[PDB]
Amino acid sequence: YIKLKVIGQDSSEIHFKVKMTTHLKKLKESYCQRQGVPMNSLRFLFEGQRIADNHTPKELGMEEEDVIEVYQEQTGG
Amino acid sequence: GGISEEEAAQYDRQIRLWGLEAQKRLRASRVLLVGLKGLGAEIAKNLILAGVKGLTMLDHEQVTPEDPGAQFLIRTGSVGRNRAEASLERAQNLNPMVDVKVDTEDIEKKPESFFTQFDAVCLTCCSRDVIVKVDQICHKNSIKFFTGDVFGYHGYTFANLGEHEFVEEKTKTMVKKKVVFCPVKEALEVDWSSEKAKAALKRTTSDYFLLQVLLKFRTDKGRDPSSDTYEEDSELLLQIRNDVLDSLGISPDLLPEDFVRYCFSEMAPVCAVVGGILAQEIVKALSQRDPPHNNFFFFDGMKGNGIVECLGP
Amino acid sequence: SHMSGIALSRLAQERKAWRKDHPFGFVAVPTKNPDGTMNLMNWECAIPGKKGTPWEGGLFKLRMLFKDDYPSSPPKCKFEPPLFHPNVYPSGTVCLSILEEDKDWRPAITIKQILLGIQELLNEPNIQDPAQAEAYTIYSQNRVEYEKRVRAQAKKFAP
Amino acid sequence: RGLPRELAEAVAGGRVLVVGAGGIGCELLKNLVLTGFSHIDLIDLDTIDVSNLNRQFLFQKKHVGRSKAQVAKESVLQFYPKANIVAYHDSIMNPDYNVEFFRQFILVMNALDNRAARNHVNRMCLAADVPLIESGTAGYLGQVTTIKKGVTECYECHPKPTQRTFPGCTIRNTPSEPIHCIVWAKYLFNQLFGEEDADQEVSPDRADPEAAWEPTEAEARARASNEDGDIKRISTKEWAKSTGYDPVKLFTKLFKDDIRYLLTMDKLWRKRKPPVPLDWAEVQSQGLGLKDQQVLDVKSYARLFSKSIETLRVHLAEKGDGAELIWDKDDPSAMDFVTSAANLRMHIFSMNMKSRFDIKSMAGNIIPAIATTNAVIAGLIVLEGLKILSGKIDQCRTIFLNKQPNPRKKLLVPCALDPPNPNCYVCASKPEVTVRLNVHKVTVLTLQDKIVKEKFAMVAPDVQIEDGKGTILISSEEGETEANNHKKLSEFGIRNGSRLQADDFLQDYTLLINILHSEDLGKDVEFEVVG
């Protein structure tokens, strides 16, 4: 059980509780459901590297209370 | 409140972003802008479109043949005119409800009482000593101080808001925060002889040292590096980098030797990006809404990084 | 009518899959443009009544509308003409759980699946979420008259 | 100029296209002109509004009502006469801008605000094999990305919604959010005054004028009186037109009788608060910020509803041949109608009434915008274009603009461009044969048999004009598209530069065909493939 922090472009701080061996697709789906936007528009990257569905925290070496950055694509201007 | 129907109609898009109260705070603020070059032109355009009470464009230099043919504020054939006078018509046409003024006097000769009428002073293409003097004057009289520059693919932005109080939306709504800034004499002369200082240097972007080198170059030659003198200016820039980074007890190696290929002339996209960032910082400081960035912002056009640094404390 | 590339490719693949193998009696063909071509984003469907049910013997025409968000958004299905059913709006729009993205709709589910779901809802409705307030009324009050009306409607729509 | 000589020549001789002349478009055009670009094509469909003067700087108060592209070109020519700006006052979705139009640009820059136009421009650039720079902006945020065929991801590799849809029953039966009431008001405006659309009919159709309830008690009389279909369910729009669009009867039908109609279904109000109908007489007799930011009482909103109904009825009567109205957020009467109806519906379902400011923000999908964000995004766009034109596509990155620095102290976050999705179906490589033939002198039957059935070896081909609307010309079914076999190819909009997709059932292989018009071919052959 590793605690993860996901912050958006507007510094929307939301905590997550995920397992060591589970894939991160569940985290993306849960964040998409909670924020009300489909996960396709959002991109989650770890230390500047995009997180794929098949990635796991062990592959990326995540530690307790770590930060995940999510960037929503804007349709306007 | 005091916002007219036409004002609301033409400001609706930014009102919906940052509140009528912050719009009103913007409407009662006067900004002084020095160095109406490309970066100065971008900052002036953005501030006038934002809808400040007034903007005093100061520039003692005239339009020269070496300047770019198109300048977005100076009509073609205006060679020999004053830059502020040339750009005044277009700047005023940008927004009719903003009192855009022109000052052709030198910034050095301006007395301290001249700066008291403004609540925000922005400096562009100014020497280091002028920057220090103007920042000291602004800090003494409690005036927000900004300065920035563009050189090749690189740009920088500095802000000295003193003891700044603002309101920021709560994460969950209007909460109050206070941030303390530092003068230029402390930001540009940060000591690097401590373990914490060494770690910060390991984590500090190299654009700060490039800014120091180019400030020294402007202090020495009296002008920014020019494309037509690329070889001599590049050799002098390398020498200045060596001496400047040796005087601080730092290893010049962290600043790449090829930095001289991307710090020449002013570029329109770099001007646009840096002017937008600096104008947003000025608007945030004037409206006292949203946390202003740390005292330094650095932009790299080739790599695409915009890095905000806190140096001086 | 301007649709996205993924929506158009998915609709073409869906049409090919339907033409390759579809349940007997069901009809799902893209509508005809006034020019003479056929429109992939507008389908003229037809759902047969299930045998052994009061809806049997009738062919109920349905219209399928796809937007550019397809398949990320469900199609808008409506009966033309609107029929008498607790879960069908008076405007003809059919309210189904699988036809709404926030309730049950998934982008991987096919036109055949939703047509079969509409047929199943036709065979048996749900009352927790009615949409008619008249079919619902005479379904909850006395079922005999509801079955009589359903039989008359099915006879009216017999091909 | 600070550019290298090779890049200087590349940008001076090259021709670029800017689609969209908004705030981002204006900043991008100014930056391109200042950088050294001489041949720029600008296309925009809108006209200058007074709300555009916050972002757009090439437009003034005296330019309101004029074309955005022409005024932008004139403003750019004011400080740089040497610029060869070509302005189009049209939509990029127009068929005139085919692959032949997109093939003359060395770089295409997106400055749009909707996903549909972005999808069309992405498809056209992918077809024409022209690099595309895609950008967006919303408030303090924004991003810039590069799209290249076969190198980077396209706009459809990871599909995104174009607009948010709502459940059919939730909007009209069980609203739970103010946005539901707002979209209900918009759909009601379309139903009462706009064109026919069964998906926007939010008010149920029945015997309207009589105020009726307790159908459960009188179900026997109701079923004796009405047959299946309920006397064809007299249309609400027809009844409103017949009554003369009088505000009182419309108010009673929409906010009292319709709510009582909802209350008949007692099964879906067991776990939610039932709505409370409003009586017009009771509402009438019951007795800082901007003026649009003030929330009024239900009586003032009922009066506003009546006034808006009267004004819209007058407009409909004045309109020629009874043309249907189209909702516009900038129309005072339509905006008043939507605000009043949405607020009344919110009050009915026990929700907080919203000011006209918020109703306009949510109904019109207004995105906050400022000049600084657009300027930053345009500068990043021009930097990416300079990187592309110099052969440095490997150095191009997806740059994100943040409102506040991330924990890595990055206000601008560049990300490496991802490789294309192998299963995209949009940017995937497909055979792209091209044929040159007389469009006006060839039939659909000849296209199907002579040049597709046997020339390209297709047994059961179905053809589809890929104009973006998904219209298919030839169907492999033996009894579907035989009526237009003898019709000429020009009668379906096929012209020079039009491309049509052809896929086979048994052969399970597709093929793209590019049509090239040629009057001089010779009497021997009506078509000729081009290697």
Ligand SMILES: Nc1ncnc2c1ncn2[C@@H]1O[C@H](COP(=O)(O)O)[C@@H](O)[C@H]1O
């Ligand atoms: N095909 C198109 N669809 C939508 N907007 C377009 C199109 N072509 C040009 N535009 C313009 O592009 C601009 C994009 O919006 P904005 O960035 O908010 O100014 C608006 O001025 C639009 O009118």
Ligand SMILES: [Zn+2]
């Ligand atoms: Zn793709």
